[PDB]
Amino acid sequence: PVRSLNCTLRDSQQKSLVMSGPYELKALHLQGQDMEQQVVFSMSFVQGEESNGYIDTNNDGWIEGDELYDKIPVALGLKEKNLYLSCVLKDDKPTLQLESVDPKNYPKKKMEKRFVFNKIEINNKLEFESAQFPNWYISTSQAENMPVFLGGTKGGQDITDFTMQFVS
Ligand SMILES: [Tb+3]
């Protein structure tokens, strides 16, 4: 049956993802004490192909282990909340929502596309691209305590890559 793992996520500026009420996630730097606030995700490996390869990011004409990319589809649930991140059109732009779901039926191998993210990993850094809306990515703001959102801009001020910590 469908493979899954539990994990926390931090954006590339070390902001942890936490619940900001039941209806959204927010990102902020957590002092070691409040680290317990981190939302635990349940990442399941859904239907679709895994790709891998190398891109020559340091431009030396060769490949190195830190240039090996992986691309694999996943769904992101919130451990024991029967909620899934999902991408939907709201007021005409791709939007990130937390969607409640029937525990009986989830998770499954064949996720509806709104739930599917292409997890792209290179040198232990992660992007989560929307399968429904390509070129849109799970993103955080530079500022503190702002919502996690779906953003179609890379390299600007918004953060679009993360690291993952595996949880027991
Ligand atoms: Tb190289």
Q: What are the structural domains of the chain?
A: 1-168 (2.80.10.50)
Tell me, in angstroms, the distance from the centre of ligand 1 to residue 88's CA.
38
Rounded CA-CA distance 68/47 in Å is 22
Query: 33: which 2 tokens?
Result: 């004490």
Tell me, in angstroms, the distance from the centre of ligand 1 to residue 143's CA.
33
Rounded CA-CA distance 116/121 in Å is 16
Tell me, in angstroms, the distance from the centre of ligand 1 to residue 68's CA.
10
Q: With contact defined as beta carbons under 8 Å apart, do 38 and 59 qualify?
A: no
Tell me, in angstroms, the distance from the centre of ligand 1 to residue 65's CA.
9
Tell me, in angstroms, the distance from the centre of ligand 1 to residue 126's CA.
19
Tell me, in angstroms, the distance from the centre of ligand 1 to residue 158's CA.
27
b/e code 6-42 from CB counts within 10 Å (16+ = b) = ebbbbbeeebbbbbbeeeebbbbebeeeeeeebbbbb
Q: What is the total residue count of the chain?
A: 168
Tell me, in angstroms, the distance from the centre of ligand 1 to residue 154's CA.
22
Q: Is 156 left (phi over 0), alpha (psi -120 to 50) or beta?
A: beta
- Main-chain dihedrals φ then ψ at residue 115, nearest 5 degrees: -95, -10
Tell me, in angstroms, the distance from the centre of ligand 1 to residue 121's CA.
16
CA atoms 23, 5, 164, 123: torsion sign: negative
How many CB atoms are located within 10 Å of the residue 112 CB?
14
Tell me, in angstroms, the distance from the centre of ligand 1 to residue 122's CA.
13
**Amino acid letter for position 57:** T
Q: Provide the 8-state DSSP code for 166.
A: E
- Main-chain dihedrals φ then ψ at residue 114, nearest 5 degrees: -60, -20
Q: With contact defined as beta carbons under 8 Å apart, do 149 and 157 qualify?
A: no
Q: What approach was used to elucidate this structure?
A: X-ray
Question: From residue 103, how far is each of 2, 20, 43, 84, 93 by CA, in Å?
Answer: 14, 22, 15, 11, 29
Tell me, in angstroms, the distance from the centre of ligand 1 to residue 127's CA.
20
Burial class (CB in 10 A: 0-12, 13-18, 19+), 95: middle
Closest CA to 41 of 71, 2, 94, 84: 84
Query: Which residues pair with residue 27 across a beta bridge?
Result: 17, 146
Q: Provide the 8-state DSSP code for 134.
A: T
**Amino acid letter for position 154:** K
Query: 123: which 2 tokens?
Result: 């040198």
Rounded CA-CA distance 10/141 in Å is 12
Contacts of 154 (CB under 8 A, 6+ apart): 137, 160
Query: Which residues pair with residue 41 across a beta bridge?
Result: 7, 78
Q: Provide the 8-state DSSP code for 37.
A: G
